[PDB]
Short mmCIF file of C-alpha atoms in Angstrom, two decimals:
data_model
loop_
_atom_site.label_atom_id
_atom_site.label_comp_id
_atom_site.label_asym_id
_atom_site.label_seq_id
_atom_site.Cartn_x
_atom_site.Cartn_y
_atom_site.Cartn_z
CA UNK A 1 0.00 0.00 0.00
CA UNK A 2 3.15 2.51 0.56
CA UNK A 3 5.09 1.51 -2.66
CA UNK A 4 3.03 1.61 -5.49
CA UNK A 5 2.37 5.05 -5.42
CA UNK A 6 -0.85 4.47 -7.81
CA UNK A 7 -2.61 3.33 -4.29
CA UNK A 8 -1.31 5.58 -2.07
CA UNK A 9 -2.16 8.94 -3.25
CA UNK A 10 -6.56 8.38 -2.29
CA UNK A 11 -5.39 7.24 0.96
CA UNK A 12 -4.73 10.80 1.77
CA UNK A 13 -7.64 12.16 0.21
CA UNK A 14 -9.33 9.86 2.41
CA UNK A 15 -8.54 11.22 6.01
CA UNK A 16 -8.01 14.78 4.90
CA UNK A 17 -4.51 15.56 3.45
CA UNK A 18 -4.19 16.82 0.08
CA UNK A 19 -2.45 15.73 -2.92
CA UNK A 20 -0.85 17.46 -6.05
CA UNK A 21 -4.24 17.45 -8.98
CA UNK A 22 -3.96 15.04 -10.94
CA UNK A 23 -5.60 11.96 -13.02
CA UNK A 24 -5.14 7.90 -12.58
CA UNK A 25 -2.54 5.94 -14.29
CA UNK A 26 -2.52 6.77 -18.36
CA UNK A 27 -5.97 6.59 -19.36
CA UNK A 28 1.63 20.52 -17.06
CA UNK A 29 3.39 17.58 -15.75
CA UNK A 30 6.21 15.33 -14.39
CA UNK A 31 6.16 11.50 -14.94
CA UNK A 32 6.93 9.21 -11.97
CA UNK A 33 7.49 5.24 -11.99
CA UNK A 34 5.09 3.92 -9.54
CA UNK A 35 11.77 10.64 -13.41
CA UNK A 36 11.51 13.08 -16.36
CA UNK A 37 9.36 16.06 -17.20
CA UNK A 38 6.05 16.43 -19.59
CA UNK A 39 5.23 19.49 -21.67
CA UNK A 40 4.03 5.59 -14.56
CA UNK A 41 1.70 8.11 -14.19
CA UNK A 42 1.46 11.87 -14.40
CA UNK A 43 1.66 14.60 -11.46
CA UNK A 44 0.78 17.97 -11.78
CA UNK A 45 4.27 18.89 -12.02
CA UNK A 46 4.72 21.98 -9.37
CA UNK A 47 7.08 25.08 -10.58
CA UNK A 48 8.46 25.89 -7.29
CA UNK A 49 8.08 23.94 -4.89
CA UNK A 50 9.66 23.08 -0.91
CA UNK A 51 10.39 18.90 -0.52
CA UNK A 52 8.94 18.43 3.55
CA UNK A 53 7.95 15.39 5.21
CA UNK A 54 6.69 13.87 8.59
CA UNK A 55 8.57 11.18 10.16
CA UNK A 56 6.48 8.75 12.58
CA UNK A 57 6.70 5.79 14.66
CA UNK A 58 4.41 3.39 15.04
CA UNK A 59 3.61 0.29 17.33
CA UNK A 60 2.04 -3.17 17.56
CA UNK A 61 -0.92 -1.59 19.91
CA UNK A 62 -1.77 0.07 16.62
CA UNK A 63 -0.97 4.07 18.02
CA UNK A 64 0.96 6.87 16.09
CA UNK A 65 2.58 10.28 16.60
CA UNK A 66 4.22 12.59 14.48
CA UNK A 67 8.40 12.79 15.03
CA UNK A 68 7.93 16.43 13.47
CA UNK A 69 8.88 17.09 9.64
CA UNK A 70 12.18 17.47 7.98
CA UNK A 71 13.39 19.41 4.62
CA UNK A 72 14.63 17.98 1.81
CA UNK A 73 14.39 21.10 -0.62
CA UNK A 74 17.96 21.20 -1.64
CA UNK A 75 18.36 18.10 -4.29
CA UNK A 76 20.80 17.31 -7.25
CA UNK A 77 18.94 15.93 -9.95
CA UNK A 78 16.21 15.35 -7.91
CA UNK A 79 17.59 13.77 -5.09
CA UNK A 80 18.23 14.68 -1.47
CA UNK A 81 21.38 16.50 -0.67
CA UNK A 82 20.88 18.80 2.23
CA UNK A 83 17.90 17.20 4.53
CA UNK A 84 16.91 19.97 7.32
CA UNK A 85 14.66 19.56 10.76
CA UNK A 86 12.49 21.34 11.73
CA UNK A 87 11.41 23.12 8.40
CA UNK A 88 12.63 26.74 8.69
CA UNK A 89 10.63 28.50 5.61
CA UNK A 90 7.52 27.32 7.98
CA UNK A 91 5.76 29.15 10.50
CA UNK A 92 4.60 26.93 13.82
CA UNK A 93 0.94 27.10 12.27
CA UNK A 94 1.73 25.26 8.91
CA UNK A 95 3.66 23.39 10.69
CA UNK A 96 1.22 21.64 13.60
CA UNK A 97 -1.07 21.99 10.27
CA UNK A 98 1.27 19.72 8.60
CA UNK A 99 1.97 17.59 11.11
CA UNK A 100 -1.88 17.00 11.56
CA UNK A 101 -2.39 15.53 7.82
CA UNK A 102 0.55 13.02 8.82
CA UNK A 103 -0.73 11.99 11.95
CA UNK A 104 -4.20 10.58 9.98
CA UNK A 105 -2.48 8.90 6.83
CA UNK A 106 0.09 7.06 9.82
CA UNK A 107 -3.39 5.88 11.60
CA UNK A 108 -4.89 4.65 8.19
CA UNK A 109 -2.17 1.85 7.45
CA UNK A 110 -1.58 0.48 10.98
CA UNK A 111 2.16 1.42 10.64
CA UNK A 112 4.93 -0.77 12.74
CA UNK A 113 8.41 1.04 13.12
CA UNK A 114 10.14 3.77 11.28
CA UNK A 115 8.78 5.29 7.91
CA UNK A 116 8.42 8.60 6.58
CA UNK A 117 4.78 10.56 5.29
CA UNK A 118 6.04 12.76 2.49
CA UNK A 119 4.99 15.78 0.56
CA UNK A 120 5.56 19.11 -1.63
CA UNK A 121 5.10 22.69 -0.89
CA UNK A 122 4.41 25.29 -3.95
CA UNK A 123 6.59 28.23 -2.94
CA UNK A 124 4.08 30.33 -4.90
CA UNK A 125 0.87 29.45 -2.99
CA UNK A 126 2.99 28.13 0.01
CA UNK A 127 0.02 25.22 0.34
CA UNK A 128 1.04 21.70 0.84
CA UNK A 129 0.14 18.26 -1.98
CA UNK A 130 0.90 14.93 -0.44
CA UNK A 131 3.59 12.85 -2.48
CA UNK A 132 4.85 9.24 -1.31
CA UNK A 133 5.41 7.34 2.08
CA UNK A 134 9.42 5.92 2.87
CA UNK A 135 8.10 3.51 4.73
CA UNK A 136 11.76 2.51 6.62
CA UNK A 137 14.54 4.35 8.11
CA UNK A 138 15.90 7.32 5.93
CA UNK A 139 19.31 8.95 5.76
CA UNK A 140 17.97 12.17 7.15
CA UNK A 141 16.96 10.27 10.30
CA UNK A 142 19.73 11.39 12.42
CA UNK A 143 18.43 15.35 11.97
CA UNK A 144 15.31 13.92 14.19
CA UNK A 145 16.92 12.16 16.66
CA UNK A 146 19.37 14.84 18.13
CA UNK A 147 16.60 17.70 18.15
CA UNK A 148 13.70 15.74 19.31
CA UNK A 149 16.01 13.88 22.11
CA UNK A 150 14.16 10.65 21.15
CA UNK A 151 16.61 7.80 19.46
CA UNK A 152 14.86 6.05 16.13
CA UNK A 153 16.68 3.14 15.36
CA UNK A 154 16.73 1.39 19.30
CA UNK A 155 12.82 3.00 19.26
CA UNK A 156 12.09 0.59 16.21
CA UNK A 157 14.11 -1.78 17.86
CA UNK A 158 11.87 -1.79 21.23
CA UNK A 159 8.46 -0.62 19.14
CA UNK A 160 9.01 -4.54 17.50
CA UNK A 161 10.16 -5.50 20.87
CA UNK A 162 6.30 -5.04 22.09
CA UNK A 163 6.05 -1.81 23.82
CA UNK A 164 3.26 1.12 24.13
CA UNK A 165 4.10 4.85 23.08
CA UNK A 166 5.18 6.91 26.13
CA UNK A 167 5.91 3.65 28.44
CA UNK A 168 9.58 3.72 30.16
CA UNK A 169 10.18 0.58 27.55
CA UNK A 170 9.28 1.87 24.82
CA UNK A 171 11.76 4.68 24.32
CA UNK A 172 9.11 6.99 23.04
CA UNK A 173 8.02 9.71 25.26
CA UNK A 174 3.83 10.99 24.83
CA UNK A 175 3.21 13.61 22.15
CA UNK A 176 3.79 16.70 24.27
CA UNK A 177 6.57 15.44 25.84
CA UNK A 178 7.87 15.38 22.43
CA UNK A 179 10.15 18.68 22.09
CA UNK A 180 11.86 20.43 18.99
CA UNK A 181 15.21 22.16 20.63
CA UNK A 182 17.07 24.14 18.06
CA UNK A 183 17.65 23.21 14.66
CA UNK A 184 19.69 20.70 12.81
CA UNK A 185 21.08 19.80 9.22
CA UNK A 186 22.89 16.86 7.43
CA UNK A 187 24.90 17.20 4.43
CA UNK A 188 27.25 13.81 3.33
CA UNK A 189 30.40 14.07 2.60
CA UNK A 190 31.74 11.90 -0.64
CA UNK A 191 34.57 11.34 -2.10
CA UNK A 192 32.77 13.08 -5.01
CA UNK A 193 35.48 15.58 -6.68
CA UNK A 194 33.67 19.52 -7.67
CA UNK A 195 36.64 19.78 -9.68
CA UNK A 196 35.99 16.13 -11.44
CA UNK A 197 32.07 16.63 -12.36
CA UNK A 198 31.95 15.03 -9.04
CA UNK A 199 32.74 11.56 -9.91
CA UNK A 200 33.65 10.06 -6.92
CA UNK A 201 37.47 9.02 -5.83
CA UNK A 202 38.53 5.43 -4.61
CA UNK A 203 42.01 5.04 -3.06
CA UNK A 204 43.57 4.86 0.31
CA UNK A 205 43.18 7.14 2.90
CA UNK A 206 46.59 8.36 4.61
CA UNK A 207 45.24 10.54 7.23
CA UNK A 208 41.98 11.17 8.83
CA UNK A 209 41.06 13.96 10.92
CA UNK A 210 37.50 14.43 11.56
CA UNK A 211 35.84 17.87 13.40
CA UNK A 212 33.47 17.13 16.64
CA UNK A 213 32.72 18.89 19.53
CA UNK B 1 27.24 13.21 35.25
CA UNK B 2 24.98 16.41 34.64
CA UNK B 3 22.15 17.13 36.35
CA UNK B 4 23.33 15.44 39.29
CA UNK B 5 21.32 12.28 39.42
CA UNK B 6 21.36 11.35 43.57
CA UNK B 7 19.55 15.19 43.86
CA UNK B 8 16.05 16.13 44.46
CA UNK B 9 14.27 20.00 43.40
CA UNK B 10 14.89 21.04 46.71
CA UNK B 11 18.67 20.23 46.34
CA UNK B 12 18.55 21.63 43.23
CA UNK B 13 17.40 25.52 44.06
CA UNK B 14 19.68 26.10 47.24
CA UNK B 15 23.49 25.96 45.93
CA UNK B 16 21.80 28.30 42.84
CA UNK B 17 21.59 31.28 45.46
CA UNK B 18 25.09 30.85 46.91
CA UNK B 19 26.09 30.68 43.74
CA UNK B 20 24.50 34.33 43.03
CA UNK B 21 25.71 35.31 46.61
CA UNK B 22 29.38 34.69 46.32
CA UNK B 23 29.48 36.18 42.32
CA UNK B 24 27.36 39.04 43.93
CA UNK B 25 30.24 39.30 46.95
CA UNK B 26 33.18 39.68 44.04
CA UNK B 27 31.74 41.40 41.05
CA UNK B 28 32.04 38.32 38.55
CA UNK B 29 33.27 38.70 35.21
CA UNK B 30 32.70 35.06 32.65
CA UNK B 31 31.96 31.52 33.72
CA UNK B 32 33.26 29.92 36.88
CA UNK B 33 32.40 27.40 39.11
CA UNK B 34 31.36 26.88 42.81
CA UNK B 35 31.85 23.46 44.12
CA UNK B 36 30.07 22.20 47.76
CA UNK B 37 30.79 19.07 49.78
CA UNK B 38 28.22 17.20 50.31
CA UNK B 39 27.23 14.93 54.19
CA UNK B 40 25.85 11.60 52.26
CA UNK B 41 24.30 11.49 56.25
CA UNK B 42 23.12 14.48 56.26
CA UNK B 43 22.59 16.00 52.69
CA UNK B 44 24.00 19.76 53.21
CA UNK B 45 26.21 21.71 51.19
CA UNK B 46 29.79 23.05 52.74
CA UNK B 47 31.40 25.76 50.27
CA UNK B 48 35.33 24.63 49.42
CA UNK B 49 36.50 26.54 46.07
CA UNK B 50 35.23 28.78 43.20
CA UNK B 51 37.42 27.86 40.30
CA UNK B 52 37.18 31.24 38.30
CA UNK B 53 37.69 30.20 34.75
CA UNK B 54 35.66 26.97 32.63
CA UNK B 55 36.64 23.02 33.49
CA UNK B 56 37.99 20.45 32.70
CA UNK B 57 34.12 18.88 32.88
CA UNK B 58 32.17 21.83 31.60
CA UNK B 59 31.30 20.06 28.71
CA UNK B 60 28.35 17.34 30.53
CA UNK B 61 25.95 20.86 31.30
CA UNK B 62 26.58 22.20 27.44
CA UNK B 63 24.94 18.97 26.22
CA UNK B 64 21.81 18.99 28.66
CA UNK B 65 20.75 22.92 29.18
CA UNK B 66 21.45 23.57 25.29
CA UNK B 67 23.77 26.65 25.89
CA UNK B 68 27.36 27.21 24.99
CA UNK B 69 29.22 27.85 27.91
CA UNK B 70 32.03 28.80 25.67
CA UNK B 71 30.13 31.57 23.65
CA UNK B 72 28.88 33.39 26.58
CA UNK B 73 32.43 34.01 27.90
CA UNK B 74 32.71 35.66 24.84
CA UNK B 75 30.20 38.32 24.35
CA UNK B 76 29.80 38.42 28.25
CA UNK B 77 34.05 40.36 28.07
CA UNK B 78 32.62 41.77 24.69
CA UNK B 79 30.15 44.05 26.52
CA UNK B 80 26.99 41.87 26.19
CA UNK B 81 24.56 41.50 29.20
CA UNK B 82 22.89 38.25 30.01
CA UNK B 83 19.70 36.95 28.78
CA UNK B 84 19.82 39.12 25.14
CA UNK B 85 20.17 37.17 22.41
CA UNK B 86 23.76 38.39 21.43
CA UNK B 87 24.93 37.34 25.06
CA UNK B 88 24.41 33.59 23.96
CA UNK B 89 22.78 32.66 27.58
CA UNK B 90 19.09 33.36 28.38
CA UNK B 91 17.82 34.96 31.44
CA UNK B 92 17.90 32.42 34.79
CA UNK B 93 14.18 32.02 33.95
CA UNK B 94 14.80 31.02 30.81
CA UNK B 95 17.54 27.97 31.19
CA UNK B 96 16.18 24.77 32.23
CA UNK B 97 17.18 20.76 32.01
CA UNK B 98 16.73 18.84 29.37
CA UNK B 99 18.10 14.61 29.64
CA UNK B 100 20.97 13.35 31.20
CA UNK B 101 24.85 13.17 30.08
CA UNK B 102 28.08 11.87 31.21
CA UNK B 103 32.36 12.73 30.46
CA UNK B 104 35.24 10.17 30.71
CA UNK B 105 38.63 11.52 30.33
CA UNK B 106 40.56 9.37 27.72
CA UNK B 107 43.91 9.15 28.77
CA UNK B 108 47.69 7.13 28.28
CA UNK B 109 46.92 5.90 31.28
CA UNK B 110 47.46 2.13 31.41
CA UNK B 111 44.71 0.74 33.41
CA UNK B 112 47.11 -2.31 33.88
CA UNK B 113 50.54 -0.80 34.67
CA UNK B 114 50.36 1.67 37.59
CA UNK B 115 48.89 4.41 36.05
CA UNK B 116 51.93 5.35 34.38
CA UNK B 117 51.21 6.84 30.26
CA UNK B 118 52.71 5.27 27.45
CA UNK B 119 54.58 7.28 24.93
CA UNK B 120 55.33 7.98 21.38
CA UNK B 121 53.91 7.03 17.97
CA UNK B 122 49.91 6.09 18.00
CA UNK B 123 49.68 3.94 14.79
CA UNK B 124 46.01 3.79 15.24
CA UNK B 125 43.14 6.23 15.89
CA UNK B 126 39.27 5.45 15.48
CA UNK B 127 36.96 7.54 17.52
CA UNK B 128 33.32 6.67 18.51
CA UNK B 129 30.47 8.98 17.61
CA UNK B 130 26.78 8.29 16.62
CA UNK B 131 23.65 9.43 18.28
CA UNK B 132 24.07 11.23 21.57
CA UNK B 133 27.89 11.92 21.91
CA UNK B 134 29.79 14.31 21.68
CA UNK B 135 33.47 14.49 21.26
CA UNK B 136 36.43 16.87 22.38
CA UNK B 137 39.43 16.07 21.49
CA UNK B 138 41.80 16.80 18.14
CA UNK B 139 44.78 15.93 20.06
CA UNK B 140 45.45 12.66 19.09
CA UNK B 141 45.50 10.92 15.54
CA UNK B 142 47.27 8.09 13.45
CA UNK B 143 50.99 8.37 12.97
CA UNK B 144 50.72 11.33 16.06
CA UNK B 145 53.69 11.90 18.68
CA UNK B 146 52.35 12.55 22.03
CA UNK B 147 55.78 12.92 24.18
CA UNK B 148 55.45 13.11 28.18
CA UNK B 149 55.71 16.52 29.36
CA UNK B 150 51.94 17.76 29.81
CA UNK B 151 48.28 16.22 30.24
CA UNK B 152 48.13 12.76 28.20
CA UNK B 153 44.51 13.42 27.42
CA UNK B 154 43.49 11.70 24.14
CA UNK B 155 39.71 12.44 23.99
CA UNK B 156 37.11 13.51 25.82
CA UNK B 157 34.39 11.63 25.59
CA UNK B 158 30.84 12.59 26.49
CA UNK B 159 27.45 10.67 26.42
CA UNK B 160 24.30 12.21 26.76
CA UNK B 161 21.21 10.23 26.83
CA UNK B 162 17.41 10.40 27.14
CA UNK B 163 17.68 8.75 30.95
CA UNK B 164 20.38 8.17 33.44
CA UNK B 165 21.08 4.90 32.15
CA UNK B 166 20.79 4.90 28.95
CA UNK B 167 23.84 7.35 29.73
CA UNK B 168 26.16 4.80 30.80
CA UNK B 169 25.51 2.23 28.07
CA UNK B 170 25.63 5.12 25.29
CA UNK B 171 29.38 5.57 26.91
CA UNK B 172 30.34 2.19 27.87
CA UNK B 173 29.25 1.31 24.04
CA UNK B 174 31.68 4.45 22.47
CA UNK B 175 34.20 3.77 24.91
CA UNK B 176 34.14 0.10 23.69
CA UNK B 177 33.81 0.95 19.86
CA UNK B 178 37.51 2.62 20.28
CA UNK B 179 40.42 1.48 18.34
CA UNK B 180 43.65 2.79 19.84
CA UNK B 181 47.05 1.35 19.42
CA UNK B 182 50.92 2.56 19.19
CA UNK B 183 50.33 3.45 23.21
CA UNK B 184 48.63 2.28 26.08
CA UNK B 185 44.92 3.20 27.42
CA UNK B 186 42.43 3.55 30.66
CA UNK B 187 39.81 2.60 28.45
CA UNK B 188 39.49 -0.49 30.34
CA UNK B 189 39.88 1.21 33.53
CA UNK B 190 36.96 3.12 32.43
CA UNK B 191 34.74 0.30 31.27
CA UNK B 192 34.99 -1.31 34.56
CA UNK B 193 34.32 2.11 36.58
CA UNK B 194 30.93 2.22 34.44
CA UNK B 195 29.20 -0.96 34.80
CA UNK B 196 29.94 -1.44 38.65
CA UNK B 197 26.63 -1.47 40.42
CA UNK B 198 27.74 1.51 42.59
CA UNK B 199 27.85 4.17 39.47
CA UNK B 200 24.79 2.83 38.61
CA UNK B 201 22.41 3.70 40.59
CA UNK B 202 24.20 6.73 42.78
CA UNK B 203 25.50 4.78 45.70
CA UNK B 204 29.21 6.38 45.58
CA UNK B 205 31.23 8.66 47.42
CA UNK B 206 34.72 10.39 46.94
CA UNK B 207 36.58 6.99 48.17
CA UNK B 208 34.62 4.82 45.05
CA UNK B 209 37.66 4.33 43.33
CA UNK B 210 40.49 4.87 45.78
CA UNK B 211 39.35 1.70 47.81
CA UNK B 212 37.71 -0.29 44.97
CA UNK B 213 47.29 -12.93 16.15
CA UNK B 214 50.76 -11.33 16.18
CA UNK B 215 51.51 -14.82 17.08
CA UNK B 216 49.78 -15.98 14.04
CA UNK B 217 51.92 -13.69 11.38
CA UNK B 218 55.08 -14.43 13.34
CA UNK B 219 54.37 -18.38 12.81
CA UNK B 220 53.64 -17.89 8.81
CA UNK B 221 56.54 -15.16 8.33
CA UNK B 222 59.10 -18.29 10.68
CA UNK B 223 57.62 -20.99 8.10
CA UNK B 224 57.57 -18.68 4.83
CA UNK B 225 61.49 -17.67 5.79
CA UNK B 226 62.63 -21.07 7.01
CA UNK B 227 60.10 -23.67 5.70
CA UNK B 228 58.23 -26.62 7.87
CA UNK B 229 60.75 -29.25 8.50
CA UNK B 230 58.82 -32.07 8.24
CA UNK B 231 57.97 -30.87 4.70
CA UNK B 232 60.90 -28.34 3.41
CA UNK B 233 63.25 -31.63 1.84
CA UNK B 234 60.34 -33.56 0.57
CA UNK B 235 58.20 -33.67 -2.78
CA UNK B 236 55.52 -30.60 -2.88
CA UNK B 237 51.82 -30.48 -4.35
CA UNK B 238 51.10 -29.80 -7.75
CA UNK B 239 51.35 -25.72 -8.34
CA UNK B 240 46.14 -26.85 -6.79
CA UNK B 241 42.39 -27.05 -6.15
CA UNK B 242 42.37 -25.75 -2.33
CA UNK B 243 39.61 -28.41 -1.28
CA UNK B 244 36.08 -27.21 -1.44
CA UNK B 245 33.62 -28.60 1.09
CA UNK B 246 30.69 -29.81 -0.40
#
């Protein structure tokens, strides 16, 4: 139900969150596989637009809550490159707005463990139009975890172990003891060369000296 | 550890006003410190020293009230007053607690040679990070020198964690993770100061501690150099399908 992406979409016209207009399967575009451009099926393909997402967590009691959302705006050829949390181009009422769309769509599929609700903002109406679920851990995950205090991959670990949402066992506090402090990014770094058209470099390394702190 | 864990509320609001009494009593410029003894009888505070400058364990109350110690020595000498946003810190009723954290100093201290360092060339250096720890160090590397002549500390390594416990685990499982080699380490010193039942669950005082391969490549190298004498003067195999088991 969260891979093909041609019965996913109704789901979240179902319990209230939109999604991008469009028409079903091949009977002002972009072409996804259930990529190019049009001038799978076919999405109403947005000028502008702001890649944000809610990450939940989900149990075997059947219960849900909303790990906040993350952005994933900046993208070479389409794909994530910088992945932000929370979203800064949103004010805390889009944002709690948001985040109650994703709480629904997470109820409607009975979700166990780690997995992503994801969507697309038009930076010229600044509205939101549901887009896929990652249903799984992401890459971005660790942009959660440090500013929500809350660690995702032992909470999946114990949420399969057998254990309720905001119970000592769990490691999953209640919703509003669920707090954003500050604000946190995650960019990769690859042995992708700028001065190479980024094609990555193999070798061996003779001297590593990371920055903490 | 920061907060400190064997403390109630109560504890925790009475050293915060001799704290503004004695910076009150000397006009105090930047961070500093004010350290009390406390009766594990009785539960009262006795003032020893002020140490008027950061520590060497600052570090475990950055990572749980969300404010840079370091920054606000900064704008605090700059001319900034306290609780502005360009002074770094917010107002007392602003800062408040958020989890629980722990440092271990990572040191050439040989757990198992009396506590002397080890010197010279480290030909290995992995650190530990991952969720909820944070590392100073940038001493200490692959290939580095570290002679005897100041503080042997390697890193500093600090776990933070959603509970108490989950602390200790989050440390004991970095302080595990750690590959170090060229000179000796109190890593297992601190492995076994972690896990003891008395860390655990707050039941120590100041007198815890006080009264608390190669073989393999050597063997091939002796046979590849000198040969197996049962076999070197005898017929050898074929130049050969190793076996394969079916």
């Amino acid at each position: 139900q969260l891979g093909n992406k041609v019965a996913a979409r109704n789901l979240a016209i179902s319990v209230g969150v939109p999604v991008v207009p469009a028409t079903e399967p091949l009977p002002p575009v972009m072409l996804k596989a259930s990529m190019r451009v049009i001038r799978v099926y076919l999405e109403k393909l947005v000028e502008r637009a702001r890649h944000v997402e809610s990450q939940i967590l989900g149990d075997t009691h059947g219960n849900v809550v909303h790990l906040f959302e993350r952005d994933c705006s900046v993208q070479r050829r389409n794909q994530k490159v910088v992945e932000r949390a929370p979203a800064p181009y949103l004010s805390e009422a889009q944002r709690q707005e948001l985040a109650a769309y994703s709480l629904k769509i997470a109820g409607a599929t009975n979700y166990i463990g780690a997995g992503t609700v994801e969507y697309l903002m038009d930076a010229d109406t600044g509205k939101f139009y549901f887009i896929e679920v990652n249903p799984r851990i992401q890459v971005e995950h660790t942009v959660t975890e440090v500013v929500t205090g809350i660690d995702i991959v032992k909470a999946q670990i114990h949420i399969l172990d057998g254990a309720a949402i905001g119970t000592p066992q769990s490691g999953v506090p209640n919703q509003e003891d669920i707090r954003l402090n500050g604000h946190a990014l995650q960019c990769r770094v690859t042995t992708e060369d700028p001065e190479h058209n980024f094609i990555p470099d193999y070798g061996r390394i003779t001297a590593y000296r990371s920055a903490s702190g | 550890r920061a907060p400190a864990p064997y403390l109630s509320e109560a504890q925790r609001q009475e050293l915060a006003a001799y704290s503004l009494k004695i910076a009150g009593a000397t006009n105090y410029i930047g961070a500093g410190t004010v350290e009390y003894l406390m009766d594990a009888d009785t539960g009262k505070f006795y003032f020893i020293e002020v140490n008027p400058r950061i520590q060497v364990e600052h570090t475990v109350t950055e990572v749980v009230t969300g404010i840079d110690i370091v920054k606000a020595q900064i704008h605090i000498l700059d001319g900034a007053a306290i609780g502005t946003p360009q002074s770094g810190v917010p107002n007392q009723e602003d800062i408040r607690l958020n989890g629980h954290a722990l440092q271990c100093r990572v040191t050439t201290e040989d757990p198992e040679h009396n506590f002397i360092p080890d010197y010279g060339r480290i030909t290995a250096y992995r650190s530990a990070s991952g969720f909820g720890i944070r590392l100073d160090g940038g001493t200490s590397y692959s290939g580095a020198i570290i002679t005897r002549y100041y503080d042997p500390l390697l890193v500093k390594v600090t776990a933070w964690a959603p509970n108490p416990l989950e602390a200790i685990s989050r440390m004991d499982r970095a302080l595990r993770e750690f590959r170090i080699r060229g000179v000796a380490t109190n890593l297992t010193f601190l492995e076994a100061i972690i896990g003891h039942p008395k860390f655990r669950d707050n039941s120590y005082t100041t007198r815890f501690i006080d009264t608390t391969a190669t073989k393999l490549l050597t063997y091939l190298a002796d046979v590849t150099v000198n040969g197996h004498p049962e076999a070197k003067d005898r017929p050898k195999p074929l130049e050969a399908a190793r076996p394969v088991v079916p």
